[PDB]
Symmetry: C3
Subunit: 62 residues, 3 copies
Amino acid sequence: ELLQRCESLEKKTATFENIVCVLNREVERVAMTAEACSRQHRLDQDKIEALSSKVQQLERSI
Amino acid sequence: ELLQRCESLEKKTATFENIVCVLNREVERVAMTAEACSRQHRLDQDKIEALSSKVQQLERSI
Amino acid sequence: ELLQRCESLEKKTATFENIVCVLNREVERVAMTAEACSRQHRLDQDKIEALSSKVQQLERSI
């Protein structure tokens, strides 16, 4: 049993080196896309307020 | 003690695999949520621009 | 054999779990982040709809 039970544990642990390399790669990339939206949400929240202050004057002068 | 240490590893090894399968599906899922966000800003990247000049036009006309 | 072969398995898996546990933390931080950057994309959607109708008026006047 043992020699077989460690041989399939070390075979399984061999596979995990690249499983974890993948999982990390994946998350790195999702830490990126979600970093972008957090920046592009401030680009759509400030430029949307700034033109709100503009129409506020255009309709005021009418 | 070797049999126990071996048992402890098969254990700790199977919890680890599941943990990664959960993490992987959860990433698959987040990447989706970040791609829907990119599919939301595209409509604004447009909407913002369209009203960025339409107000500039109603600003020159005055 | 089993002598070192088991301590080396003890070390490779100890390592791999801290890895998964740090990656784990990062997935949750990102998922929570990308829920908010998305939650707030609906209100941003409301806010830019409110202004899309004012112009429809300003362009009607002029």
